Fold Thermonuclease.
Amino acid sequence: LHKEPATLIKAIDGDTMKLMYKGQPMTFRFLLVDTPETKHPVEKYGPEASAFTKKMVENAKKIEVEFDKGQRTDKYGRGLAYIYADGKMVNEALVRQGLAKVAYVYKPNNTHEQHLRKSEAQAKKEKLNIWS
Ligand SMILES: Cc1cn([C@H]2C[C@H](OP(=O)(O)O)[C@@H](COP(=O)(O)O)O2)c(=O)[nH]c1=O
Ligand SMILES: [Ca+2]
């Protein structure tokens, strides 16, 4: 895998955002996690996950996207990637806080699964947020 540059256009919610990628606006959806819904057609911690993500990416110097080794988009046309804000993976950061659960694990796009699962285990052992 490798990291590629992108530019933040707009934070959407905990696990989805608009980025400029190779000169084109796209929706990206984080691999391997699910944050609570803000706009369910509010779930608890939805607002908190959205705010955490928005702050992390809006404050960043540099945003990067890292595709996994399979599909790079979902059926909605969303980019599927690990997003990094100044070198810190946002997907992992949310899970470490108990603001996302590890979810949507679709092979072959599961390279960081164990990593995320170990963060989730710690967040649950610390009883944070979703696990409180
Ligand atoms: C994270 C992820 C979601 N999805 C699909 C599964 C879910 O489909 P359905 O909409 O049919 O349930 C939806 C969840 O995204 P959201 O969590 O943004 O709604 O996106 C993928 O296909 N690949 C992925 O890697
Ligand atoms: Ca979600």
Q: What stands out?
A: The two ends are 34 Å apart (CA to CA). The helical segments are 46-59, 90-97, 113-125.
